[PDB]
Amino acid sequence: SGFRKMAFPSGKVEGCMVQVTCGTTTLNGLWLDDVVYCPRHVICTSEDMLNPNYEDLLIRKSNHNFLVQAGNVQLRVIGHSMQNCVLKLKVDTANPKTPKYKFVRIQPGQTFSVLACYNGSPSGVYQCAMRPNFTIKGSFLNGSCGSVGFNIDYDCVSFCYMHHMELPTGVHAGTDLEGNFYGPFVDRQTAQAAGTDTTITVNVLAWLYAAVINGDRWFLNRFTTTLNDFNLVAMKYNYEPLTQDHVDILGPLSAQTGIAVLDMCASLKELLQNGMNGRTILGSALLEDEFTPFDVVRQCSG
Amino acid sequence: SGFRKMAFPSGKVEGCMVQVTCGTTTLNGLWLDDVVYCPRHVICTSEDMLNPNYEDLLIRKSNHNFLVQAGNVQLRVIGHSMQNCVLKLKVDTANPKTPKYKFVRIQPGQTFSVLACYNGSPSGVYQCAMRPNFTIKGSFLNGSCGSVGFNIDYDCVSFCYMHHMELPTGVHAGTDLEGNFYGPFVDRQTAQAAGTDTTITVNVLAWLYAAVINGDRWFLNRFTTTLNDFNLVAMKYNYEPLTQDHVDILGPLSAQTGIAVLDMCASLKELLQNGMNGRTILGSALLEDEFTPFDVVRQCSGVTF
Ligand SMILES: *C(=N)[C@H](C[C@@H]1CCNC1=O)NC(=O)[C@@H]1[C@@H]2[C@H](CN1C(=O)[C@@H](NC(=O)C(F)(F)F)C(C)(C)C)C2(C)C
Ligand SMILES: *C(=N)[C@H](C[C@@H]1CCNC1=O)NC(=O)[C@@H]1[C@@H]2[C@H](CN1C(=O)[C@@H](NC(=O)C(F)(F)F)C(C)(C)C)C2(C)C
């Protein structure tokens, strides 16, 4: 029992982290097989951070302009290509620590772990969610770029995020491993701001189910709601509209607790009206929205 | 910027986790050099659990009663012995993935990373504090025993915790890797309860510094308190007393933020006496106490391993 913000074990990702240097810019790279993936802005100097022409900057580079370092070893770069906003460096060594992996593009609400890295070395692992506004509330300093977000399913690592930038609210934007940004952001130092963020409603409901499974019922009520009445109320607390897809996905937690999804929505409605009045749920006086239905089943099995 | 509950990278520890089976009990072992460490209660049948005689169970078992698997590989056990509440299995093979390590015993308030494992398989990593009542607020199911807690200092893993049990309140108790329990607990199936917990004051202050470093400043006031005045209000709300040591440890954060410790004490005193007035700090409605001063400096500086 118990309920923790919990990250995947970082070892399979630690074995893939390299340092990538181009001129005087150093950030992190993900060495999978014989490719190093990293943010393409590694090829930027300070001036052209505003309107970089990445194709023009990249055509001016030779393979030998890229310092890739894995611990002591300099890897030999034998190819460079750009895919969207990631630079792919072909190297002369397959990484022998390469885990089973896939690249996956996630949707807002989805959770994942971040291995925060500096100079190709891991600082820490934490658990994130893709916010509705396509930002992540990360912990990233100078040189963090190329740090990745991942899930692990059995022994397969699904890379879903590569870190590129921090927005003015102290929140973070990045790409999938195909170099496509999450949300409307660009890898330019032009004026960009996160849209108004909303609460991941399906995730709050999952967490309320976890509270029940861990034996807390104080916030339940004898009410139900229509999906539509629920959304009309939730949206006034800047909650994401709950969809039928979201109701379906709460099915298993509903079955394990015996609390109908729309009954739990009724509870959430009242929680939004009343707050906690000094009470907590699972050690929080906020409603937690960075645990998916899948995270709750994984931690609350027995 | 940003501030997250951050665990140490778990890779050096994942290379050491194995599955130990004795009879029908499977749990996790820590394989370092040619020894596999695990809770001694692995040898217990349902009967034994209730009033175990560990020494006696142990001596009546051949090495072959201990099934140790690192992935698809069976390790050969060539010896077994008890040290307090940990079983040590001598294996015929040094773990080629053994990191630089030591066994360390941590103090209440100190934080560490737990690598939750099942069937020798790392499932999750989370950052924990040793509560003042020597429990941890963990997340552990059946088969999680032998899951370990650690810190990393450079490339040295300091193992500080092995998971043994869950108390009725849904909190967790365990030993250092020398099998000494944290807290007044025993590895028997018997009614035990966590004593009353207190808040790790020095950690809350470090976390308020983390807030200030990330621009979360609303709870700052102009006032300064004293240790004595603060500690009189602190004890009353079941907050650990703050020592001159605690104050000295915050000096780097005090100097970085321009917020003196006894000012942050005044801010924390007001928060205890006033609550947060529908406000959050670093996305929490509650005062967080599972970040140490060293945790805040390391995360806010970008220290790597
Ligand atoms: C990678 N090494 C950093 C990660 C940043 C640094 C501070 N915290 C982080 O997460 N990435 C960058 O420096 C990117 C990079 C140029 C500028 N940049 C930014 O993150 C900047 N932000 C923006 O330009 C904004 F607001 F538009 F997102 C900065 C002001 C330095 C935080 C490029 C090419 C975007
Ligand atoms: C090891 N794999 C489990 C881990 C437990 C199982 C549920 N969550 C956990 O953290 N450890 C045990 O099953 C230990 C073990 C016998 C019984 N036990 C307990 O954790 C039990 N607790 C207690 O008896 C109590 F309350 F005193 F702490 C149990 C009721 C099964 C949770 C021994 C030798 C203590």
Short mmCIF file of N, CA and C in Angstrom, two decimals, chain A residues 1-12 14 115-119 121-129 136-141 166 170-172 280 283-286 288 290 298-302, chain B residues 1-12 14 115-116 118 122-129 136-141 166 169-172 280 283-286 290 298-305:
data_model
loop_
_atom_site.label_atom_id
_atom_site.label_comp_id
_atom_site.label_asym_id
_atom_site.label_seq_id
_atom_site.Cartn_x
_atom_site.Cartn_y
_atom_site.Cartn_z
N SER A 1 0.85 -1.21 0.00
CA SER A 1 0.00 0.00 0.00
C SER A 1 0.88 1.26 0.00
N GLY A 2 0.24 2.43 0.05
CA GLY A 2 0.90 3.74 -0.07
C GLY A 2 0.77 4.23 -1.50
N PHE A 3 1.03 5.51 -1.72
CA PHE A 3 0.90 6.12 -3.06
C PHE A 3 1.97 7.20 -3.18
N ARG A 4 2.92 7.00 -4.09
CA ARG A 4 4.08 7.91 -4.25
C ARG A 4 4.09 8.42 -5.68
N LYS A 5 4.32 9.71 -5.89
CA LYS A 5 4.89 10.13 -7.19
C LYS A 5 6.12 9.24 -7.32
N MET A 6 6.21 8.53 -8.43
CA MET A 6 7.19 7.44 -8.65
C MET A 6 7.63 7.55 -10.11
N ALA A 7 8.91 7.47 -10.35
CA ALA A 7 9.50 7.54 -11.69
C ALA A 7 9.91 6.12 -12.06
N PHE A 8 10.10 5.85 -13.34
CA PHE A 8 10.70 4.57 -13.77
C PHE A 8 12.15 4.56 -13.36
N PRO A 9 12.70 3.36 -13.06
CA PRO A 9 14.14 3.17 -12.90
C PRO A 9 14.83 3.74 -14.14
N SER A 10 15.86 4.56 -13.91
CA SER A 10 16.53 5.41 -14.94
C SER A 10 17.70 4.67 -15.59
N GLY A 11 18.11 3.51 -15.08
CA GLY A 11 19.31 2.80 -15.59
C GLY A 11 19.32 2.63 -17.10
N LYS A 12 18.24 2.18 -17.73
CA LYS A 12 18.27 1.89 -19.19
C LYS A 12 18.53 3.17 -19.99
N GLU A 14 20.10 6.04 -18.47
CA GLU A 14 21.48 6.42 -18.05
C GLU A 14 22.49 5.84 -19.05
N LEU A 115 15.00 11.96 -16.93
CA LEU A 115 16.37 11.85 -16.40
C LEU A 115 17.04 13.19 -16.65
N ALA A 116 17.04 14.08 -15.66
CA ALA A 116 17.67 15.40 -15.83
C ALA A 116 19.18 15.17 -15.93
N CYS A 117 19.80 15.62 -17.03
CA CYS A 117 21.25 15.41 -17.29
C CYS A 117 21.97 16.72 -17.60
N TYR A 118 23.25 16.77 -17.25
CA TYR A 118 24.16 17.90 -17.52
C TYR A 118 25.49 17.33 -17.97
N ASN A 119 25.97 17.79 -19.12
CA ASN A 119 27.27 17.34 -19.65
C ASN A 119 27.24 15.82 -19.84
N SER A 121 25.81 13.60 -18.07
CA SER A 121 25.74 12.89 -16.76
C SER A 121 24.40 13.15 -16.08
N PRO A 122 23.77 12.10 -15.52
CA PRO A 122 22.47 12.25 -14.87
C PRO A 122 22.61 12.93 -13.50
N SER A 123 21.73 13.89 -13.25
CA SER A 123 21.60 14.63 -11.98
C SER A 123 20.49 13.96 -11.18
N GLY A 124 19.42 13.54 -11.86
CA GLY A 124 18.23 13.12 -11.12
C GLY A 124 17.13 12.59 -12.00
N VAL A 125 16.22 11.85 -11.38
CA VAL A 125 15.04 11.32 -12.10
C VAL A 125 13.79 11.79 -11.35
N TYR A 126 12.84 12.31 -12.10
CA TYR A 126 11.53 12.72 -11.58
C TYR A 126 10.44 12.36 -12.57
N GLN A 127 9.22 12.47 -12.08
CA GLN A 127 7.98 12.09 -12.77
C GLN A 127 7.25 13.38 -13.11
N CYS A 128 6.82 13.44 -14.37
CA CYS A 128 6.14 14.55 -15.06
C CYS A 128 4.86 14.07 -15.70
N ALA A 129 4.06 15.04 -16.10
CA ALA A 129 2.90 14.88 -17.00
C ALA A 129 3.03 15.95 -18.09
N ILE A 136 5.65 21.03 -19.88
CA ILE A 136 5.88 20.13 -18.72
C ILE A 136 6.47 21.00 -17.62
N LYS A 137 6.10 20.68 -16.40
CA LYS A 137 6.55 21.39 -15.18
C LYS A 137 7.75 20.57 -14.73
N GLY A 138 8.87 20.84 -15.37
CA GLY A 138 10.12 20.12 -15.13
C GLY A 138 11.00 20.86 -14.15
N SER A 139 12.20 20.32 -14.01
CA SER A 139 13.30 20.88 -13.20
C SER A 139 14.55 20.78 -14.07
N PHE A 140 14.92 21.90 -14.66
CA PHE A 140 15.90 21.97 -15.76
C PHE A 140 16.64 23.30 -15.66
N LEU A 141 17.97 23.20 -15.61
CA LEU A 141 18.89 24.35 -15.52
C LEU A 141 19.62 24.48 -16.86
N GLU A 166 12.89 26.43 -21.83
CA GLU A 166 12.09 26.96 -20.70
C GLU A 166 11.37 28.23 -21.15
N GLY A 170 8.53 29.65 -16.13
CA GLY A 170 9.34 28.61 -15.47
C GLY A 170 8.89 27.20 -15.85
N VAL A 171 8.17 27.03 -16.96
CA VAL A 171 7.70 25.71 -17.46
C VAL A 171 8.47 25.39 -18.75
N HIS A 172 8.38 24.16 -19.22
CA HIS A 172 9.38 23.61 -20.17
C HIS A 172 8.69 23.10 -21.41
N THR A 280 -6.69 16.15 3.92
CA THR A 280 -5.80 15.81 2.80
C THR A 280 -6.32 14.53 2.16
N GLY A 283 -1.88 12.31 1.31
CA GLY A 283 -0.82 13.23 1.76
C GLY A 283 -0.83 14.54 0.98
N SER A 284 -1.93 14.89 0.32
CA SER A 284 -2.02 16.17 -0.42
C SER A 284 -3.29 16.91 -0.03
N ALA A 285 -3.17 18.22 0.16
CA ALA A 285 -4.26 19.19 0.34
C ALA A 285 -4.58 19.86 -1.00
N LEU A 286 -3.92 19.44 -2.08
CA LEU A 286 -4.36 19.74 -3.48
C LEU A 286 -4.94 18.45 -4.07
N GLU A 288 -4.33 16.04 -6.89
CA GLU A 288 -3.18 15.60 -7.75
C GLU A 288 -3.66 15.19 -9.15
N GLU A 290 -1.15 14.46 -11.79
CA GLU A 290 0.02 13.88 -12.52
C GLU A 290 0.14 12.38 -12.21
N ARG A 298 -1.12 0.46 -11.56
CA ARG A 298 0.27 -0.08 -11.41
C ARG A 298 0.72 -0.05 -9.94
N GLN A 299 0.36 0.99 -9.19
CA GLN A 299 0.76 1.20 -7.78
C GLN A 299 -0.25 0.60 -6.80
N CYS A 300 -1.52 0.43 -7.21
CA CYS A 300 -2.65 0.06 -6.31
C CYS A 300 -3.20 -1.33 -6.64
N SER A 301 -2.42 -2.15 -7.34
CA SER A 301 -2.81 -3.53 -7.75
C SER A 301 -3.53 -4.28 -6.61
N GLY A 302 -2.82 -4.59 -5.52
CA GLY A 302 -3.31 -5.47 -4.43
C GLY A 302 -4.15 -4.74 -3.40
N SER B 1 15.02 26.46 -14.23
CA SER B 1 14.27 26.51 -12.96
C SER B 1 13.23 25.38 -12.92
N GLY B 2 12.37 25.39 -11.91
CA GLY B 2 11.51 24.24 -11.60
C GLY B 2 12.08 23.48 -10.43
N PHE B 3 11.21 22.82 -9.70
CA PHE B 3 11.60 22.04 -8.51
C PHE B 3 10.70 20.82 -8.43
N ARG B 4 11.31 19.64 -8.48
CA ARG B 4 10.61 18.33 -8.43
C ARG B 4 11.18 17.47 -7.32
N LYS B 5 10.33 16.62 -6.75
CA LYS B 5 10.79 15.51 -5.92
C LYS B 5 11.63 14.65 -6.86
N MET B 6 12.94 14.64 -6.64
CA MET B 6 13.93 14.06 -7.57
C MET B 6 14.63 12.92 -6.85
N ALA B 7 14.68 11.75 -7.46
CA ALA B 7 15.43 10.60 -6.93
C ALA B 7 16.83 10.62 -7.53
N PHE B 8 17.76 9.90 -6.92
CA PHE B 8 19.06 9.64 -7.57
C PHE B 8 18.83 8.75 -8.78
N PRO B 9 19.67 8.86 -9.82
CA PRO B 9 19.63 7.92 -10.93
C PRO B 9 19.85 6.53 -10.32
N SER B 10 19.06 5.56 -10.75
CA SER B 10 18.91 4.25 -10.05
C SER B 10 19.77 3.17 -10.72
N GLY B 11 20.42 3.51 -11.83
CA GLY B 11 21.16 2.56 -12.68
C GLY B 11 22.15 1.73 -11.89
N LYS B 12 23.00 2.36 -11.07
CA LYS B 12 24.03 1.65 -10.27
C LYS B 12 23.36 0.63 -9.35
N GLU B 14 20.09 -0.77 -9.92
CA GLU B 14 19.37 -1.75 -10.79
C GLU B 14 20.31 -2.92 -11.14
N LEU B 115 14.44 2.19 -4.62
CA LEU B 115 14.17 1.45 -5.86
C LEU B 115 13.23 0.30 -5.55
N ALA B 116 11.93 0.52 -5.79
CA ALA B 116 10.88 -0.48 -5.56
C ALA B 116 11.11 -1.60 -6.57
N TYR B 118 10.19 -6.02 -7.60
CA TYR B 118 9.30 -7.20 -7.50
C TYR B 118 9.98 -8.30 -8.28
N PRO B 122 13.41 -4.13 -10.91
CA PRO B 122 13.12 -2.75 -10.56
C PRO B 122 11.87 -2.27 -11.31
N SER B 123 10.93 -1.74 -10.55
CA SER B 123 9.57 -1.34 -10.98
C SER B 123 9.47 0.20 -10.95
N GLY B 124 10.06 0.84 -9.94
CA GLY B 124 9.95 2.29 -9.74
C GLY B 124 11.01 2.81 -8.80
N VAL B 125 11.26 4.11 -8.89
CA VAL B 125 12.20 4.82 -7.99
C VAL B 125 11.46 6.03 -7.44
N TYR B 126 11.57 6.27 -6.14
CA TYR B 126 10.99 7.48 -5.50
C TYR B 126 11.91 7.92 -4.38
N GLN B 127 11.87 9.21 -4.12
CA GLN B 127 12.60 9.93 -3.07
C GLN B 127 11.69 9.94 -1.83
N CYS B 128 12.28 9.59 -0.69
CA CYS B 128 11.66 9.34 0.63
C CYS B 128 12.44 10.14 1.66
N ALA B 129 11.82 10.43 2.78
CA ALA B 129 12.54 10.81 4.01
C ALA B 129 12.30 9.69 5.04
N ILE B 136 9.00 5.08 6.87
CA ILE B 136 8.99 5.83 5.59
C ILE B 136 7.57 5.72 5.02
N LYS B 137 7.11 6.80 4.41
CA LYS B 137 5.81 6.82 3.69
C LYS B 137 6.14 6.30 2.30
N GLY B 138 6.15 4.97 2.16
CA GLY B 138 6.57 4.30 0.92
C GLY B 138 5.41 3.94 0.02
N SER B 139 5.72 3.31 -1.10
CA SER B 139 4.72 2.65 -1.96
C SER B 139 5.29 1.28 -2.29
N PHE B 140 4.71 0.27 -1.65
CA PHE B 140 5.24 -1.11 -1.58
C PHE B 140 4.07 -2.08 -1.53
N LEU B 141 4.05 -3.04 -2.45
CA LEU B 141 3.08 -4.16 -2.49
C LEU B 141 3.77 -5.45 -2.05
N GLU B 166 5.17 -3.43 6.20
CA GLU B 166 4.16 -2.35 6.17
C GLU B 166 3.39 -2.35 7.49
N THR B 169 -0.86 1.55 9.48
CA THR B 169 -1.21 2.91 8.96
C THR B 169 -0.85 3.07 7.47
N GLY B 170 -0.34 2.03 6.79
CA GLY B 170 0.04 2.10 5.37
C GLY B 170 1.43 2.69 5.16
N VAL B 171 2.18 2.88 6.25
CA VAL B 171 3.61 3.30 6.26
C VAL B 171 4.51 2.07 6.43
N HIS B 172 5.81 2.27 6.24
CA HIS B 172 6.79 1.19 5.96
C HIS B 172 7.96 1.26 6.93
N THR B 280 -0.51 28.21 -2.79
CA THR B 280 0.41 27.06 -2.91
C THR B 280 1.84 27.57 -2.87
N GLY B 283 3.69 24.38 -5.97
CA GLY B 283 2.56 23.53 -6.39
C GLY B 283 2.02 22.65 -5.27
N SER B 284 2.42 22.89 -4.02
CA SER B 284 1.88 22.17 -2.84
C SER B 284 1.01 23.12 -2.00
N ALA B 285 -0.12 22.62 -1.51
CA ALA B 285 -0.97 23.29 -0.50
C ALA B 285 -0.47 22.97 0.92
N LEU B 286 0.48 22.05 1.06
CA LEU B 286 1.05 21.62 2.36
C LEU B 286 2.53 21.97 2.43
N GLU B 290 10.30 16.68 2.74
CA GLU B 290 11.12 15.55 2.20
C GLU B 290 12.18 16.07 1.21
N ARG B 298 21.66 20.71 -4.32
CA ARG B 298 22.05 19.80 -5.44
C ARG B 298 21.11 20.00 -6.63
N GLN B 299 19.81 20.05 -6.38
CA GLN B 299 18.85 20.13 -7.50
C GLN B 299 18.95 21.51 -8.15
N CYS B 300 19.15 22.57 -7.36
CA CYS B 300 19.12 23.97 -7.85
C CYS B 300 20.45 24.36 -8.51
N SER B 301 21.51 23.57 -8.28
CA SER B 301 22.90 23.72 -8.83
C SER B 301 23.14 22.80 -10.04
N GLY B 302 22.36 21.73 -10.20
CA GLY B 302 22.51 20.77 -11.32
C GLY B 302 23.65 19.78 -11.10
N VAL B 303 23.86 19.33 -9.85
CA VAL B 303 24.92 18.34 -9.49
C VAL B 303 24.58 17.03 -10.22
N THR B 304 25.61 16.37 -10.75
CA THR B 304 25.48 15.11 -11.53
C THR B 304 26.34 14.02 -10.88
N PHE B 305 26.20 12.78 -11.38
CA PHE B 305 26.75 11.54 -10.76
C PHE B 305 27.51 10.73 -11.83
#
